[PDB]
């Protein structure tokens, strides 16, 4: 009664999967497996009443457990790392994650219990395991606090007498600039000697987060270190070679 | 009796694969297999009511458990993904389907129970197996709703007072376009001292996802870029060097 009672379930499971509307050699090969796999336990489970010896069966039934147990790690992983994320989740929908080790950037769209949703950057959905979740650094671009200008300005070598005055100059600059953030780290300092250049180091930060006022606000930057590169008499310096001739 | 009907079960079998086509020698020796195969199984099973000591049948089959469950890992594994995919997929038949850890890029042809059946782009069939959809990320272009538009305009390093009007140029131009999508990201700024030239980014979205449509969208900008560089007294910036002379 008990085999009936399942294989009467397991049916109705087979013609409710053919409604929902699918291949039907599938279907009957689904309904195989669980036919199996519901003898098997049931065998194992109720295998002394009619049953055989007491060793044997705990030896195949050890041997199949130890087998199935190796061969389901990540799908059980996965589903693991997808409850440990619907407890305590470092990311929320919307935001735009990054990770140094693997290449998972984008913005969450979904969080599922086996896999996450996320929307690239060029407008494609990428599924990523959750496992992943688990033994991977997550950064959150999408919680920053502010946006990092950093550049080289390359001078000629011949340019060393005015290093002092273009630093001090841009440093000025930097300083009165209305879109930069006053309470953060302001850096311009004399620091390489490069193949071809000597090297000056620029390094703030703006108020704002905005993609869009990031970038002007560095155009601004950039055009105003042309300029005042300029009015001091240097320049900036080319790749450089000297050539001795036969 | 039960040997018996067993041996006939399978020398059914044998004749069934040699009558299907195949190699003779191959079918003896897989028949021989399945018969060394459920003598083992029997004698486990079977063994105490003619058996052995149950000490000895219990580190036997144990060790013989654990071997072979360690050694078919991969198999099993690759069927679990195949129910996996069957009740829970991230793509169906048809989707061009990608992703950043391992080389499967194309178009879906076949989902199976052990391999996924994938046509490339050079039109020749790859087979992947399932597994490896449980723990790499997978990408969809297949459901992209727009196709992106990326390009770099170097300027030359004399053409520093004229970068505005250009960038407003290109703005206006990429805005006016009617191939180009106005509710997505578009950026038009100066932000990059490359080595020999200025650098322009430019980042827009059109509507359509054809390929061929948008292969012809991106020449025309182009072209209108070249144009609108041009028009302006600018040009695009050769590789340069500085040569000094003996
Ligand atoms: C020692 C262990 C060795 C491996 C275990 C057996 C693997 C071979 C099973 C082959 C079964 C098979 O080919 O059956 C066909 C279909 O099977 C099916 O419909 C799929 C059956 C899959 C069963 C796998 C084992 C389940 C175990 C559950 C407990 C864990 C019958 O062909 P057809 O007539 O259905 O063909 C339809 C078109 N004519
Ligand atoms: C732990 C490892 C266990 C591994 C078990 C592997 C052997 C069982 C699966 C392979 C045989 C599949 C035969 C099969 O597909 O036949 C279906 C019924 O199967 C059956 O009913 C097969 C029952 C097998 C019971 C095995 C008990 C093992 C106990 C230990 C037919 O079903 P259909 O009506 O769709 O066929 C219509 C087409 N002929
Ligand atoms: C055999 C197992 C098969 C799976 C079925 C079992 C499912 C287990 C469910 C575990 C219950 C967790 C209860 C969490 C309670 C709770 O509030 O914890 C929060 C999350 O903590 C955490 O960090 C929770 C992490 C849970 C990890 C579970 C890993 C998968 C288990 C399999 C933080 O604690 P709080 O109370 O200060 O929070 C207050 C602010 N919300
Ligand atoms: C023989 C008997 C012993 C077996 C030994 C282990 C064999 C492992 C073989 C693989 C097992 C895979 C288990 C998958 C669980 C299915 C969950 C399910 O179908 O419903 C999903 C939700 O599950 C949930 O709600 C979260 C479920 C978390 C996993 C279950 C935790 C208890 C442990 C269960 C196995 C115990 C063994 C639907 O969600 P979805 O995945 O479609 O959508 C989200 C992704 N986008
Ligand atoms: C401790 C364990 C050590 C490893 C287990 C034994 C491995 C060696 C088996 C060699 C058998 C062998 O060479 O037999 C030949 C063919 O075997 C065959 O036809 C293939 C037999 C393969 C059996 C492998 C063990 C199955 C165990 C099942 C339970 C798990 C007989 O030669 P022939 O006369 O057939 O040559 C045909 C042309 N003349
Ligand atoms: C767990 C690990 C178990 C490992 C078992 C390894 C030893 C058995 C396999 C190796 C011997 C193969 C001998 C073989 O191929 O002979 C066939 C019959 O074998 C047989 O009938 C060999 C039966 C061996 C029974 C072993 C019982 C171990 C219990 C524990 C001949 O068959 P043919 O008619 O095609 O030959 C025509 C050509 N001579
Ligand atoms: C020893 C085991 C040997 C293998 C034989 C056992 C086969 C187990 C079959 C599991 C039955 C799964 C039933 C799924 C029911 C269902 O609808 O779940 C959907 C898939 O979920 C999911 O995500 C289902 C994931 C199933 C993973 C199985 C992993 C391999 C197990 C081995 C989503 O759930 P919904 O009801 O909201 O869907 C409504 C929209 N279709
Ligand atoms: C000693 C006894 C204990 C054994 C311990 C584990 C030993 C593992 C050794 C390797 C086992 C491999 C099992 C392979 C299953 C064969 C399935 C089969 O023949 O029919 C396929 C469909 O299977 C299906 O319908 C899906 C079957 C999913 C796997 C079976 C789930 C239950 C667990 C069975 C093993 C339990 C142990 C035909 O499809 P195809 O692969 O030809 O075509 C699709 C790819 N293009």
Known sequence: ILTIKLFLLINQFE?????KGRDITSARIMSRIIKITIIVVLVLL?????GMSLSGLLTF?????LAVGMAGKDILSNFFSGIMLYFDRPFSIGDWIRSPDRNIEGTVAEIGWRITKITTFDNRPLY??????????????????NRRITTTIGLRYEDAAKVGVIVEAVREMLKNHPAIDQRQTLLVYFNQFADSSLNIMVYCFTKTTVWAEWLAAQQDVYLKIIDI?????????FPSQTLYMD
């Open 61 to 65: 039934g050890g041997i199949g457990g």
């Open 128 to 145: 990523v395991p959750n496992s992943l979740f688990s033994s991977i650094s997550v950064e959150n671009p999408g919680r920053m606090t």
């Open 15 to 19: 013609k409710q999967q053919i409604k």
């Open 46 to 50: 109720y295998g002394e009443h009619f």
């Open 229 to 237: 590169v300029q009015s001091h008499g240097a320049d900036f310096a």
